[PDB]
Design a protein around this ligand. Structure first.
Ligand SMILES: Cc1c(C(=O)C2=C(O)CCCC2=O)ccc2c1c(=O)n(Cc1ccc(F)cc1)c(=O)n2C
Ligand SMILES: Cc1c(C(=O)C2=C(O)CCCC2=O)ccc2c1c(=O)n(Cc1ccc(F)cc1)c(=O)n2C
Ligand SMILES: [Co+2]
Ligand SMILES: [Co+2]
Lengths: 381, 381
């Protein structure tokens, strides 16, 4: 059931913004590790005396990395005279965010029909305002409300290239890397208490609970009208034998925040081949692969969707497979992106639910917790 | 003239420590860009609840990247019960350093005969103490004094692998990258006033002025007894037509700090080939190459040291060449390592002064300021 109760017109995920201490080094690491091209910049060379912001793109996926300059460079500015290209940016907020949480996602940005209306309706329905709507060069409107912890939901709307004040990157500085990643599939938060978090966000968005199907978590998924914007949220389950990874997150993150970004690939085999080649030369590491028991067990579960060669290719790359009543999910998880055991990335590809593909086809892989555990026990025997 | 006036026995440069916001991302970027292998770690997985520290090595060059965890992880600790592997580390100091200066060098570490003696003699001769001598596992002693700005000179001495509490890295996580870099040749500071900086450092070390031979700077070089530890210092020259890059440094860095690290290569051609291949895929960019006039002019200056093919190889890679009365210097400079126009790296190789090679053979390339300017003007004509 999808009651289509969005309180304003939402289109798709637009970008994800990381708040960094040094945007250059994080952006260069991410570019090489994920196969994303340098696409736009806003920094000293573009007249921005406030913050350095670098945009990476792969297909429709947009990662923004932002870090503050010394406040002394902009000490004479006021908001009416700012050289910042992102008017919501604040030196103190960014330094405090990074001190508290380390490297992580500050903003989950969605494109909407009218950011000023989305902001007004959201706040009228309980959203905690973070940054009021600001019109940039009479061309783009951006506004921000609190999502969870210190993460904001950012609304962006275009009258008719990223943001005014950003320059396209000189293609000599823009190597055309591409490992197959194409868009953001979902963005997941960790919170201490799931119920109040869901009530808050569904309250101000009108997002509905996405239909789904004892190890760590309780979760639920909020979805836009066409279920293309997907915001799962997790809470820990306390008192178990193996400590909940959600609770570990909350301890090392200093509270609620974004847990993982799931990036859709148009060819998950190629993406994982390319990412794994680079794991030890600057890129990203992956979680330990499941035992061969797990792949022997794949034949009985997905042998009608994947051939034996396709299954052994999953085994080569450590790919997990799960199944809905409608579609099949291929997924794999990186180790944490930075120093703290907090944020990580998921690579996914979905098969089925053809109409275009419907959002959330195959689910989110919750069935893979049990399957992984069983495979580990069976391999031990 | 070298009066050999060191007040304690100094051996060689030992390591350089960067203070970061996220040590993982900076270390991975640097590893790929410079061809340095992951060699040791001290972090949550080794029992360090205070800071994450990753060591990269290439030959004898050692780069350490350190970032603080949330203070909450170590809130119950006191210095006598610390899990930090570097006892001088302080959460507040590190966060304040990074807020003020951005990504940069906190410590220039030299190996000495006896770090406790070096510290005592240094402070008795005017050094401002930063961290007192601490003996680690009855095996290594480390102490720190102020060098300039918020940079410390770190003394390390070994009774008889990096530091106790660091673990060697599992070689599956240690890809054997190597682009030819072998050691730190010199480390350079920028200060507002050269005279007082020189008097201070030479005062407490006994380092002597290194013998040398109107665009930006005044500089001088302090050297150890065998002139293997080389610490140049620059001050700006104000009131010129083109603004001094030393003054730009001081403005964006919020004062004095480390300007550049010069890394000796055993094969500067191979190093630059490998680094330039990676500039746009996560590595480091280089300053704009000199005009062909500069390389046409090389024949008359170094045509007795380099063949025509060796000179055109310099032209392929943008390498600068300068000459002493004793030796020849090949050098090139990266663009700034991070967001701010502050710290950068120099790659160098020296030819001549064979006895082993004597330190500082060929100088530091100050003659290349004039040669670059002349080449630019001649190319314009
Ligand atoms: C994050 C994740 C998901 C996931 O995407 C997801 C959502 O999108 C929304 C609903 C809740 C949720 O969970 C699915 C399966 C995962 C993982 C995952 O993180 N891990 C990692 C892990 C490894 C060993 C260990 F001991 C503990 C955790 C998995 O193993 N599976 C199998
Ligand atoms: C840092 C450097 C050195 C150097 O190593 C050095 C020391 O070790 C100690 C003594 C002082 C000193 O300077 C030598 C030559 C350099 C540079 C350098 O930084 N640049 C970069 C530059 C480019 C364009 C522009 F407009 C301004 C600066 C150069 O061009 N040359 C030619
Ligand atoms: Co997921
Ligand atoms: Co130099």
């Amino acid at each position: 059931k999808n009651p289509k109760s969005d309180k304003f017109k939402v289109k798709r995920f637009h970008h994800i913004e990381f708040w960094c201490g040094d945007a250059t080094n994080v952006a260069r690491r991410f570019s090489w590790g994920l196969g994303m091209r340098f696409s736009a910049k806003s920094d000293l060379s573009t007249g921005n005396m406030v913050h350095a912001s670098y945009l990476l793109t792969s297909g429709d996926l947009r990662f923004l990395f932002t870090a503050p300059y010394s406040p002394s460079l902009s000490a004479g500015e006021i908001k009416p005279t700012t050289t910042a290209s992102i008017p919501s940016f604040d030196h103190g907020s960014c330094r405090s965010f990074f001190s508290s949480h380390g490297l992580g996602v500050r903003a989950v940005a969605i494109e909407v029909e009218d950011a000023e209306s989305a902001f007004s309706i959201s706040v009228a329905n309980g959203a905690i305002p973070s940054s009021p709507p600001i019109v940039l060069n009479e061309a783009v409107t951006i506004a921000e409300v609190k999502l969870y912890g210190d993460v904001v939901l950012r609304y962006v709307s275009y009258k008719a290239e990223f943001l005014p004040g950003f320059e396209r990157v000189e293609d000599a500085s823009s190597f055309p890397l591409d490992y197959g990643i194409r868009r953001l599939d979902h963005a997941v938060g960790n919170v201490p208490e799931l119920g109040p978090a869901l009530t808050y966000v569904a309250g101000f968005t009108g997002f509905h609970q996405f239909a789904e199907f004892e190890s760590g978590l309780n979760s639920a998924v909020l979805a836009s009208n066409d279920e293309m914007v997907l915001l799962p949220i997790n809470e820990p389950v306390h008192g178990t034998k193996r400590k909940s990874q959600i609770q570990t997150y909350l301890e090392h993150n200093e509270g609620a925040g974004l847990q993982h970004l799931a990036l859709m690939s148009e060819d998950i085999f190629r993406t994982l081949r390319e990412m794994r080649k680079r794991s030890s030369i600057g890129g990203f590491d992956f979680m330990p692969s499941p035992p061969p028991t797990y792949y022997q067990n794949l034949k009985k579960r997905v042998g009608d969707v994947l051939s034996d060669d396709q299954i052994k290719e999953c085994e080569e790359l450590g790919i997990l497979v799960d199944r809905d009543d409608q579609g099949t999910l291929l997924q794999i998880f990186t180790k944490p992106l930075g120093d703290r055991p907090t944020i990580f990335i998921e690579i996914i590809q979905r098969v089925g639910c053809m109409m275009y593909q419907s959002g959330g086809c195959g689910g989110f892989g919750k069935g893979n917790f049990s399957e992984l555990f069983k495979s580990i026990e069976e391999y031990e025997k």
